[PDB]
């Protein structure tokens, strides 16, 4: 149970990336953990809203990269997609608290979340094009629709980051806040905010604000499945996945 801690606290689960060296990059075994610990959590009724977390200073620098380079997986069938599936279909509060670097996944599971805490120099990314890969977590469909074309195109088809002042002021995060520790308290704090509303209709409102989306949602995921799958078997991307190790 080494790279992902999962504190129960009241009425609270926490799921805190712990892998420092690798600046928290996810492997098949995080994914699973948190697929099944989001699939179990959702089925406990002690449990009311689920953080997420890298900690003070890391959130995650995104999928592993050697896990991509030696065993390409089937997005649909493979760990990662079940961690997708599983955040997606989450019927509860998830809130992620993000310093440093969101990369890739790192910032497009956050499209999934219902509260989003980052500090003011968090570096998101989503560097799919850098690496000849393509959009994933449904964010071809997502971020356009929040933001416009041109703006979603600056950060997919160009790879631009951003820092967490710009993610508060885009509204992919809630709010801005001091780097470090106080991202997560204050994450912590909403959180408790939840704990005082009626367990139904918090669920229920957040099922009415998914549901218009949620078919559509399921066949992006699906079709960017397929074409990343394929890209990741395809020279473009070994290339330059290879490339960013012995960088
Ligand atoms: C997040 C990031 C900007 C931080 O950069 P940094 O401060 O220079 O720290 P490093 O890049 O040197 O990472 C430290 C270590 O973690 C490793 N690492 C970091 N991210 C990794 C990843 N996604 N996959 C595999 N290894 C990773 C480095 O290879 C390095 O390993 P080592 O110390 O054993 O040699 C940078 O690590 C990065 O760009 N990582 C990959 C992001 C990415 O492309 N994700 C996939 C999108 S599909």
Redesign the pocket.
Known sequence: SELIRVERETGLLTLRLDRQ???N?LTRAMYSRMAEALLEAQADTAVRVVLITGGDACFT??????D?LEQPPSLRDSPVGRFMSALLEFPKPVIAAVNG?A???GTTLLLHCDLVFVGRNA?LKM??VN?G?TPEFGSSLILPRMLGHAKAAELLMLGQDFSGEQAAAWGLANAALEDGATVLEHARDAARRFLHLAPSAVVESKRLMKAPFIEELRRVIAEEGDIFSTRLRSPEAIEALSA??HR
Do not use: C, E
């Open positions: 060296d690798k600046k990059a620098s995104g999928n592993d990269i050697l991509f670097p990369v890739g996944i570096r560097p799919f690496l890969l960013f190790m």
